[PDB]
Amino acid sequence: AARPPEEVKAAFDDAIAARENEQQYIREAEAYTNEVQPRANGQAQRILEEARA
């Protein structure tokens, strides 16, 4: 075995967790987009109906 010391092992684990968090941020951004767009569509329909009225 050629493991690095424990102190830097913590940093190695942090780097792997950083990769996972990097993926998670993009996932949340796509979530925000998919959430926000339908609300815009609904507001557009609402203002169109208000104009008709």
Partner: peptide, 30 residues
């Protein structure tokens, strides 16, 4: 019919099967 000294055949041992039971991640990665 030469037997390498670092082989298990140099000893009286024969390995018939090697398998992995479970592969886990460190608790931070998990």
């Amino acid at each position: 019919p030469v037997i390498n000294p670092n082989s298990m055949a140099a000893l009286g041992i024969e390995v018939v099967d090697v398998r992995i039971k479970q592969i886990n991640l460190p608790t931070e990665v998990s």
